[PDB]
Structures are given as structure tokens and as C-alpha cells.
Design a protein around this nucleic acid. Structure first.
Ligand SMILES: Nc1ncnc2c1ncn2[C@@H]1O[C@H](COP(=O)(O)OP(=O)(O)OP(=O)(O)O)[C@@H](O)[C@H]1O
Ligand SMILES: [Mg+2]
Ligand SMILES: [Mg+2]
Ligand SMILES: [Mg+2]
Ligand SMILES: [Mg+2]
Ligand SMILES: [Mg+2]
Ligand SMILES: [Mg+2]
Ligand SMILES: [Mg+2]
Ligand SMILES: [Mg+2]
Ligand SMILES: [Mg+2]
Ligand SMILES: [Mg+2]
Lengths: 98, 127, 79, 151, 112, 100, 206, 79
RNA sequence: GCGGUCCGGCCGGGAACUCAAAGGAGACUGCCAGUGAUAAACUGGAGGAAGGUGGGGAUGACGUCAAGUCAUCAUGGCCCUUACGACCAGGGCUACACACGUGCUACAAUGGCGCAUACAAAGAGAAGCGACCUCGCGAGAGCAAGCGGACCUCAUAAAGUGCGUCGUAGUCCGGAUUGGAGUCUGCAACUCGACUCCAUGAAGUCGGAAUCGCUAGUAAUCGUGGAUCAGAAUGCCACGG
């Protein structure tokens, strides 16, 4: 029915949000799909660390985007009522489909 | 009634089923000659169970993904090795002594900024 | 090399040419539009074009129609 | 080198003939990482030698090898600011290696036809003590005899 | 054997490339338009087909006409007074390459 | 970095947003297979009469904090130097030191 | 220059981040600019407030700024009026509703930013540079700290030629990644130019 | 003139006179830059080989060939 | 695995498998023998996927070169302040008797060129990536789905293999340099873009003294991607065979 995708830069933080969301769907009692770890992304940037000419001296940084999936399939009006406006997750984005 | 192993080598993964019947092989829904007989990389695929007298006791279903020609050959050979623990490990020593149990972890090195490919420094000059 | 359709010319240099054929051959036209190509109705004119520091005059000939004015004005002087 | 004793890589047996001796030969003739080409040339050249010799496949390879693998060699072994090459014996493992390198290098010379024939000619001449490889083994053997004073 | 000059001994497709103005594809188009096999050589062609080859080549500017055409092009640019013409006169590259270190082809063999 | 240059960037961004964001009919619409009865010509000339700051080409996309034209990074909007400065003290969220 | 940044190398290991929000490429640049404007305004405004850490999190299309300080009352001002005249200026520089919170640190001599800030103020106060750094090291060590290093570089005392002087007491392992090392930088704009101050404060091994 | 790598090649060369045969199934290739010392007893066929190479004699088993860059200069046994 | 067929995971279906995630176990000379000063340790061995810091990356001590950057910034002094500040168009940074550094493509048969076909990894995308289809010999142009992406697109990987030919020639090697015809982006390709087609076919037949890199998935070779970027990599940064 409705599928929830969560992206974050911290895995220790997103797993809390996705477990809190799946718990709230489980506050109806049962029948949740379970979290699904879609493959992460690793953006990478190489920048010169000198302010002038030293090309071989550079640092490389990466931003890891961790991403989970929930995919609630139970059309429970209690679930959607308690899902929206009541998850209250900060630092982690929520998509939720229909 | 099938017995399984995975096998991995050089960014390639395999799946092998060792179901016991007459001696034959199928890889990605074809045999070696049409699939893997190219470059005649069939020796390594044959090598484990040849040592274990493959004859007419094993029919093989083989799947593989990733890696090139030789990389997939190493994965299947390693997979067969891990697959041939249904005939109990009584042959594990007789199979490990020749190898095939090491995963062969060696693989490509990263590009190593400042160099050309992971060790190749650019040409140097004092002047 | 230029486009499939619509050859290019600056508006100000187009207008000066139309004013030329209207008023006939006249004093040289001083333009900086080294990019605008040549049209047939510029032939017979002695328009001068910038070379970065001076207006080198070029007398437009029948052949020079597919080219641009800057093609006939060198910029860097060597020897 | 300086510190350790390095390990070996144990090589893999030759597909068509179950001898690792020919596998090392394919590796030496290899260029640019193209092993399929290297084995294809060696197999074809050794096959068209089987028609020229009589020995099956491997005996006609060893009797060529045994002719061009040297026994002693000169290496620069200065002591007191010296400039003379001391003749020294060659270990058995290097004897095969020096033989294969000389055969392949000579085969890359003597440009007559495709690489299949150039290899095929050289092993046939080695099998009868005649080629450029067997000439090279004699040159180093003659350079060690001239230097036999230094020991 | 004809075609202004002499094509010798080669496959008809690649022998014909000896014509100044005929390359790999024009020679392929000629042999396609003449119905001659690509793989056959110039000595196996009948005199009843080389005349067709002369007809096919006649639908293209070739040695005498082409070298005049090229000479007219360069001279018209040289006499034009345009930048391409100026580069032709002085012998310097026209397409806009380096002249700091390269351009040995246009400049010729190195001289101090 | 020569504040005049930062002003130039703002002026170009102001003009690029003023015309080309809404007005796109000359470059886009007129250059199709449309009838060219001197109407493609006039829209060709109309582009000249427009101010020289035509949106995409004229901007430099320099660093926001210093106005550095070289070494710009789109993901962060800063040059290489100010990215590393902000990354090292934890300004950029997620930008770990990274190794593999 | 050869040392990695002590904070940056530990950003995912032991130290936290100073910004904790998610944004795609479309608004990643625009966010970073806004937080820079927020931090730059906050620091220049709350200069006398002894601000150590400004951490910004952006939840639910809103911006939240946490101001770690040593004098909370001086940031609150008078029962909250200073907070409100910051929340508006912060929100009026970001264009989005802003929530301002503060966090008291009850160890102002154990915070590298506060300590480096203190030493720079004395340098502009014409305090002898040796006196300031020795006082800083002693205060942190007696207040409870496994170690501290203070390095001051520039024209120390108006010397025509610059020289870097550093003083270290205790243990401070810059290579141990599990070490709780708190490092910050500051500058002093004396009449002799800039004098740069670096402060490392090691507190615990994990 | 400059010499390519293919200079001379003979394949299974054979020549006889009456009932006495001088060359029988001879094959060899001459790499460039080489000096070939031809030795043997009297009338063994040394000069007739030069006759075949120079083209004044026609071998029974044929297959004498020279590279297209080859230019031949021959000095006879008799003055 | 199970019978299902528009034979393609398409299909209900199943968590067995690869995976992609998090959390875990694992490798510490742990065990054995020998050497060793009843040591530190070393040399072998069993077990194991991995064995003696398993592979490699981040990590760069005090200091040196008053080394490099007041042109990323910040900043003490000086200076200009109806000009050393500001705006605009054109030009230049792309010049060219020469010299050097770093590279790419070659001087071929372990190859070139045709036809057929196999096996990757990583990554990027919303004024963006742009299927399919139609028209172009092509660069591509029109129409136009899908995709903020393990879903869609970029994206058929190439060396490989199979067949045929070319038979050692400055050639069916080399692909420069010039002449036409054009496509794109861009307000605009003359100075001074890239790319495609037709024509041309230059040096070059392996390099003097000297000199550089590399110890294993390394050198060598083959292709792919990304940043910057409207357009513009033989550079850089990555990936795999
Ligand atoms: N036309 C001929 N009929 C019969 N015999 C001939 C003829 N021409 C040559 N011969 C013989 O054949 C042999 C070939 O000798 P040829 O002249 O080729 O030189 P050679 O003997 O090898 O050398 P050399 O000239 O140094 O003695 C000789 O015995 C010669 O007498
Ligand atoms: Mg073992
Ligand atoms: Mg590689
Ligand atoms: Mg400034
Ligand atoms: Mg630009
Ligand atoms: Mg460093
Ligand atoms: Mg062991
Ligand atoms: Mg200008
Ligand atoms: Mg070619
Ligand atoms: Mg061509
Ligand atoms: Mg050399």
C-alpha cells in the first residue's frame, strides 16, 4: 500500500527512525513488512589541500547516504492516523508513498 | 536432494548445485563448451571434481555473475570445492592439500592518488 | 561550423550596411563586430574592422562572403 | 632481496599437457597480459613441431630445452674496484628460465612468418643444436671459459 | 589497366584507392555501383567491366581535376588575405594548433 | 576577491533570472523546424538586442564565501579550500574523512 | 603544515558533527550558505557571551540552533529577551522559522574554543604570551584534564621575526583515534599582525 | 637502396645436369645485413646457385624469390 | 523447490541462494615441535577463508629548507584613492627561428580490417539523464515514455573468442597535415570549440649518450565512469577485465 523510504547520513540514527516507524505500525499489533536496507550511496570528493601548487597532496572525503524501506501494506486507518504527524523523526527524511 | 556451494573469486560470485546423477555440467543454462570453453578455461572448473573422480556421480547446475572469464572460472572451482561437502569432509584434507579451499582474496588495488595505477608513479627527473 | 539555419550577423553592423546601400558607397564603416559574417550586399564597401587596437580597413570582394570580417583582420603582429 | 626469503607462486599446469614446465613457457612468451594468445601460439607451434620431429609433444620440448639451458654464467663480481666477470654456476631452476627466455627472444628475431612458425623453427633448431638460442648458450659458455681464471 | 593511372595487383576495392580522390568508402561505392566483387583482384577483371569502372570513376573529381581544385582552393585563400590564407603563405598550421613546440609537420624538419 | 567581481556575478544572476527563466521562445521555440519567413531571422536578431548576460554562458559559478572562480564544487557551493576548512571542523553534515 | 585536523579525523568515530541535517544537491549548497550566515552573525553578535559550540540541526522545514556557552544568562540576557531578539534575526537570515536553544558548559577552562578564545583576548590585552599560555595549561590541568597542549604562533610580543611557541602538559595522543581530543583554533589581531593560537585538550581514551 | 627485412628465400631448390645432381631440396632465407660464405668443393654448384639467383638459370624445383626492395649486383668468377 | 507458459523472473509464489545492509563470530604466535640466555623472539607444522603488523588506505613526532602561497582567504606596514579604484567592446592569455619536462598514437602479423558472439565493476542524473519509434551513410534531428533512481536513462564494455582476408610492403601499418561538406552547444566557433562524412596520406621500419617505474592481482595492456563543465581531456580522480 504505502511504502516509506528513509535517507540519512548516519546509520546509527536512521536505524532508530526506521525502527520507531515500524514500531508505530506495529502499535496496531502485527502485519508489518520489516525494514529493507536498499544499497547505500558513497559520494566522493577529492580536493587539493594546499592553497597553491601542490597537486599530489589532496584529501578525499565521502558522504554516505544510508537508506531503508518499510512498505506498510495493511490499509489500517489507525495506522495512517498514527503514522503521519506522529512519527516525529528529526535529521532523517521521510517519503511515504500512497 | 541438491547440495550447494557459493564460491567467489575476483569480483565474481557463483552458485553450484551438486545433485547426484550422471556426469554433466550446465553453466548459466548452457554447458562449458558454449559458455566457458572459450579461452579453454574449463580446466579449473573441471579441476576440483576431477581430483575427486567426478565420473558419473555429479550433475552440475551452475550460475555466475560479475567478473571476467578467468574470475568466474575461479569462482566456480571454489564453489565446487565448497559444494563437495555432501560427501562428508573425509575428503576435505585430500582436497585442501591441493588448494581450492582458499578463497584467493587477492584483487585489484585502488588507484592511489598521486600515481597512475596504484603503484605506477609518473616519470621522475632531477632536472 | 556556424549553424544549420540562420547565418549570424550583429544587428548594428546589419543596419550600417543597409544604410550604406541606401546612401551608396561612402566613408569606411568603423565596426568592432569581428564575428558577423559577410553578406553579398556588403560587396564594394571599404568597412574597417577592429584588430584589438586599430581599425584595419578591408575592401569587401565578391569571394569574401562566406567568411567573417575578423578573418581578414590579423590580431597579433609577428616579425 | 635485502631482508627476507620471498615465497613462490606455484604456477598452474598447462591445460592441454599436464606439465607446469610448458605453463611457464607460455608465461614467458606472454606479452601485454594476453594469455589466450600466448597459449594459442605455443600450442600451434608445438603441434607443427610434432610433425617435424617425431617425439610426441613434450619429449620434443625437453630435448630442445636441454640443448639451450646453460650450466655456468659470468656475473660482475668486482672486489678491489674490479671490472671482470666471475664465471659462476647456474642453479637448476634458473637453467630452465634462461633457456625459455633465450628461445622466445630468438624466436622474436628471425622474422620469417607469423609467430607460430618463428617459434616452431627455433625449437626444431634447438632440438638439433643449431639455432640462435643454442648459439647464445654457447656464447655465455664461451664467455665463462675465457674468465675461468677468476673463481 | 586504367583509371588515369595504373592500379596494380591488389583487390579491386583497395587497388582503386590508388586513385587520388578514391578512398576506402568511395572505392566501396564504386564497386557496389559496378557490381564487382570486393574480394577479387584487378587481374581477374574483364575488359567488359573495367570500362564500367571508368564510368563509375567518371562520377567523381579525380587526379587532374582534383589537384587543380585543391590548388585553386589554397590559392584563392592565399590571394584572399584571410587568416587561413595567411597561414598557408607562411607555412604555419591553419586549423589552430600549437606553434610553441609542435607543428613540425607544417614547419618541416627542425632547423635552428 | 575583488568585490567588483562579486558584484558582476550578482548582476549577471539578476539578469539571467529576469529574462531567460521565463523568456525562452527565441532560443528554444524559434530554432525548431518552424516556418522561417523572416520570423526566425528576427528572433535571431532579437537575441542580439537582449543584454549580453544570457543565462548559462556568462556566469562563473564561484565560491560563495570568498568568490574564488577556480576549484568550485557544486555539491557544497564552495571552493576546495573552504570545503576543507568547513569539513574539518564538522560544518558539512556527513563529510567523513573517508578511506578505502 | 603536516598534522591532520584533530576534529575532522574523528568526525564519525568519537567527535560529533556541528550540522546534522539531510539535504539533496538542490539545497545542500543553499543550506550550507544559510548556516554560514547564521554562525557568522551569531559569533560576531555573541562575542562577549563566550560561545564555544554552535550546532545547527534542520528538522521539519525548520532550523534549530543550539548555542553551547559558558555564560547562559548572558546569552538569555534578561529572562529571555536576548533569546527572542536572536531567534528573529536568525530566522530573518534563514527565511524559515528558527528555534534557539542553549547548552551550559560548566568547565570553561576545559573547552578548547573557550580556552583559545581566552588566550587571544589577553594577547589583544597586551598580556605576555608566556603568562597567558602557562595560565591556560595550569587551569585545565587542575580543573581535571588528562592533558593539554597550547601552541601560539606569530610575532610574539612584537618581535620583528615570528616564532612558534607551544607548551604541553600531560598526555595528548594525536594519533589515537579513540582519544577524546578537543581541539580548536583562534587568532589575535594585535598591532603586530595576526598571532594564531591552537589548543588541544585531551580528556579521555574513549 | 634501403633494404627491407625480406631479402632472399629459396624453397626446396633442386638442380641437376644430366645424371649428376648438384642441389637437392635446398631451402633457406637470407636476413638483411648478412654476409653468406658459400663454400664447397669444385663444381659443386656454387656458381650455378648464383646463376639461379641472378635469373640466368631456371631451377627444376623453382621457388627462388627476392624482396621488392632488393637490387642485385653480381660479380662473376671469370673476368 | 513446486507443478505452471505470451519460454523472458514474464507468472502467481518462496525466503533456500547471490546480493545490500545493519548487528554479530573470527586471527591473538591461539595450539604443537625445534632453536634460543630456565627470556624477547625466531624457524617449521596442524587447524582455518585468512598466520605471524593477512592485503591497503586514513594516519606524517621534534624539527629543516628565514621552502610555497599578502592572487582562496585573514592580516601589520607601506602605497593609489576624478586612479594602481569602476564600466563597456575588441584583442591577448592559444604567438613561434628554438630548447626542456610530463603524456597520448604509432612505427605492425602476439597485428590491421570485415562478419558473429561472451564475460564487468564503479558512478552520475531535475532549467538533468533522456527509453522506444521515425528521418539521417554519420555527428545527430523530430516526437516523446520513464527516472530524484538496487526500478528509468546514460549503458551493446573493450581487450577475448570463431570465421575470412591481408603475406612484410612505408603496406589493407601509421591517421599527422591540408581541401570540401556539415551537426551540436553557445548572443556569438575569425583570431580560438568539440564531433561526423568525403578526399589527402606526413614523419615514423623500435630510438645516441643518458634515464624512469614496478615485487603480485603488482608491471603491462584493455575498456568504463566522475569532478570541473552551456560546449570543450591524450590531464586528474576512480572502477573493473
Ligand atoms: N651446361 C652444363 N652441362 C653439363 N654440366 C654442366 C653445365 N654447366 C655446368 N656444368 C657442371 O656442373 C657443375 C656446376 O659447377 P659450377 O660452374 O656451377 O660451379 P662450382 O663447381 O660449384 O664452383 P667453382 O666454379 O668454384 O668450381 C660443374 O661440375 C660443371 O662442370
Ligand atoms: Mg593450509
Ligand atoms: Mg586496472
Ligand atoms: Mg577582498
Ligand atoms: Mg563557463
Ligand atoms: Mg597530511
Ligand atoms: Mg602454516
Ligand atoms: Mg572583455
Ligand atoms: Mg588503417
Ligand atoms: Mg578518412
Ligand atoms: Mg634505446
Amino acid at each position: 500500500r504505502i511504502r516509506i523510504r528513509l535517507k540519512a547520513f548516519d546509520h546509527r540514527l536512521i536505524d532508530q527512525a526506521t525502527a520507531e516507524i515500524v514500531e508505530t505500525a506495529k502499535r496496531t499489533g502485527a502485519q508489518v513488512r520489516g525494514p529493507i536496507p536498499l544499497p547505500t550511496r558513497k559520494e566522493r570528493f577529492t580536493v587539493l589541500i594546499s592553497p597553491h601548487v601542490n597537486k599530489d597532496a589532496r584529501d578525499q572525503y565521502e558522504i554516505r547516504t544510508h537508506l531503508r524501506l518499510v512498505d506498510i501494506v495493511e490499509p489500517t486507518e489507525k495506522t495512517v492516523d498514527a503514522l503521519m504527524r506522529l512519527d516525529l523523526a528529526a535529521g532523517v527524511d521521510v517519503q511515504i508513498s500512497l | 536432494n541438491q547440495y550447494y556451494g557459493t564460491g567467489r573469486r575476483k569480483s565474481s560470485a557463483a552458485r553450484v548445485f551438486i545433485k547426484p546423477g550422471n556426469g554433466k555440467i550446465v553453466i548459466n543454462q548452457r554447458s562449458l563448451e558454449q559458455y566457458f570453453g572459450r579461452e579453454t578455461a574449463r580446466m579449473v572448473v573441471r579441476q576440483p571434481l576431477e581430483l575427486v573422480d567426478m565420473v558419473e556421480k555429479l550433475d552440475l547446475y551452475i550460475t555466475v555473475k560479475g567478473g571476467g572469464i578467468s574470475g568466474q572460472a575461479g569462482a566456480i572451482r571454489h564453489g565446487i570445492t565448497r559444494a563437495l561437502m555432501e560427501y562428508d569432509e573425509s575428503l576435505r584434507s585430500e582436497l585442501r592439500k591441493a588448494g581450492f579451499v582458499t578463497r584467493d582474496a587477492r584483487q585489484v588495488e585502488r588507484k592511489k592518488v598521486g600515481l597512475r595505477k596504484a603503484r605506477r608513479r609518473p616519470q621522475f627527473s632531477k632536472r | 561550423r556556424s549553424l544549420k539555419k540562420g547565418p549570424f550577423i550583429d544587428l548594428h553592423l546589419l543596419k550600417k550596411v543597409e544604410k550604406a546601400v541606401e546612401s551608396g558607397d561612402k566613408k569606411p564603416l568603423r565596426t568592432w563586430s569581428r564575428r558577423s559574417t559577410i553578406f553579398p550586399n556588403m560587396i564594394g564597401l571599404t568597412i574597417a574592422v577592429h584588430n584589438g587596437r586599430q581599425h584595419v580597413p578591408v575592401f569587401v570582394t565578391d569571394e569574401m562572403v562566406g567568411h567573417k570580417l575578423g578573418e581578414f583582420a590579423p590580431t597579433r603582429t609577428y616579425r | 632481496p635485502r631482508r627476507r626469503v620471498i615465497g613462490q607462486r606455484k604456477i598452474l599446469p598447462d591445460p592441454k599437457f599436464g606439465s607446469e614446465l610448458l605453463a611457464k613457457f607460455v608465461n614467458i612468451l606472454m606479452v601485454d597480459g594476453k594469455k589466450s594468445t600466448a597459449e594459442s601460439i605455443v600450442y600451434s607451434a608445438l603441434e607443427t613441431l610434432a610433425q617435424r620431429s617425431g617425439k610426441s609433444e613434450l619429449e620434443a620440448f625437453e630435448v630442445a630445452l636441454e640443448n639451450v639451458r646453460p650450466t655456468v654464467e659470468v656475473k660482475s663480481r668486482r672486489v678491489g674496484g674490479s671490472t671482470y666477470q666471475v664465471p659462476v654456476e647456474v642453479r637448476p631452476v634458473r637453467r630452465n628460465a634462461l633457456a625459455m627466455r633465450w628461445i622466445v627472444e630468438a624466436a622474436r628475431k628471425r622474422g620469417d612468418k607469423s609467430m607460430a612458425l618463428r617459434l616452431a623453427n627455433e625449437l626444431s633448431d634447438a632440438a638439433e643444436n643449431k639455432g640462435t638460442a643454442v648459439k647464445k648458450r654457447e656464447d655465455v659458455h664461451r664467455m665463462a671459459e675465457a674468465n675461468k681464471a677468476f673463481a | 589497366i586504367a583509371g588515369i593511372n595504373i592500379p596494380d595487383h591488389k583487390h579491386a576495392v583497395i587497388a582503386l584507392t590508388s586513385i587520388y580522390g578514391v578512398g576506402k568508402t568511395r572505392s566501396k561505392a564504386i564497386l557496389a555501383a559496378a557490381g564487382i566483387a570486393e574480394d577479387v583482384k584487378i587481374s581477374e577483371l574483364s575488359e567488359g567491366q573495367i570500362d564500367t569502372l571508368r564510368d563509375e570513376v567518371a562520377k567523381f573529381v579525380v587526379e587532374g581535376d582534383l589537384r587543380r581544385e585543391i590548388s585553386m582552393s589554397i590559392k584563392r585563400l592565399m590571394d584572399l588575405g584571410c587568416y587561413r590564407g595567411l597561414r598557408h603563405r607562411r607555412g604555419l598550421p591553419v586549423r589552430g594548433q600549437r606553434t610553441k613546440t609542435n607543428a613540425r609537420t607544417r614547419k618541416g624538419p627542425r632547423k635552428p | 576577491a575583488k568585490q567588483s567581481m562579486k558584484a558582476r556575478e550578482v548582476k549577471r544572476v539578476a539578469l539571467a533570472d529576469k529574462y531567460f527563466a521565463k523568456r525562452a521562445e527565441l532560443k528554444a521555440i524559434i530554432s525548431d523546424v518552424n516556418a522561417s519567413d523572416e520570423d526566425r531571422w528576427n528572433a535571431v536578431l532579437k537575441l542580439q538586442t537582449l543584454p549580453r548576460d544570457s543565462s548559462p554562458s556568462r556566469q562563473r559559478n564561484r565560491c560563495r564565501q570568498t568568490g574564488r572562480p577556480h576549484g568550485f564544487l557544486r555539491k557544497f557551493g564552495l571552493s576546495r579550500i573552504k570545503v576543507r576548512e568547513a569539513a574539518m571542523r564538522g560544518e558539512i553534515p556527513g563529510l567523513k574523512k573517508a578511506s578505502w | 603544515g603536516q598534522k591532520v585536523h584533530p576534529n575532522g579525523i574523528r568526525l564519525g568515530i568519537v567527535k560529533p558533527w556541528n550540522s546534522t541535517w539531510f539535504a539533496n544537491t538542490k539545497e545542500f549548497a543553499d543550506n550550507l550558505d544559510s548556516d554560514f550566515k547564521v554562525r557568522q552573525y551569531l559569533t560576531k553578535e555573541l562575542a562577549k557571551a563566550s560561545v564555544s559550540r554552535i550546532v545547527i540541526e534542520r528538522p521539519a522545514k525548520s532550523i534549530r540552533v543550539t548555542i553551547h556557552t559558558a555564560r547562559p544568562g548572558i546569552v538569555i540576557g534578561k529572562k529571555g529577551e536576548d533569546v527572542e531578539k536572536l531567534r528573529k534575526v536568525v530566522a530573518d537570515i534563514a527565511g524559515v522559522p528558527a528555534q534557539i536553544n542553549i547548552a551550559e558548559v560548566r568547565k570553561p577552562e576545559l573547552d578548547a574554543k573557550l580556552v583559545a578564545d581566552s588566550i587571544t583576548s589577553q594577547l589583544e590585552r597586551r598580556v605576555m604570551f608566556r603568562r597567558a599560555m602557562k595560565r591556560a595549561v595550569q587551569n585545565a590541568m587542575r580543573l581535571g584534564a588528562k592533558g593539554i597542549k597550547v601552541e601560539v604562533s606569530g610575532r610574539l610580543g612584537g618581535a620583528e621575526i615570528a616564532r612558534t611557541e607551544w607548551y604541553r602538559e600531560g598526555r595528548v595522543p594525536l594519533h589515537t583515534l579513540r582519544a577524546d581530543i578537543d581541539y580548536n583554533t583562534s587568532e589575535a589581531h594585535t598591532t603586530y599582525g595576526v598571532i594564531g593560537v591552537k589548543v588541544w585538550i585531551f580528556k579521555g581514551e574513549i | 637502396p634501403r633494404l627491407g627485412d625480406k631479402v632472399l628465400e629459396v624453397s626446396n631448390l633442386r638442380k641437376s645436369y644430366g645424371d649428376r645432381l648438384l642441389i637437392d631440396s635446398l631451402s633457406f632465407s637470407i636476413p638483411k645485413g648478412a654476409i653468406v660464405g658459400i663454400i664447397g668443393p669444385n663444381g659443386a654448384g656454387k656458381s650455378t646457385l648464383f646463376r639461379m639467383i641472378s635469373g640466368q638459370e631456371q631451377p627444376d624445383s623453382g621457388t627462388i624469390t627476392l624482396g621488392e626492395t632488393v637490387k642485385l649486383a653480381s660479380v662473376d668468377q671469370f673476368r
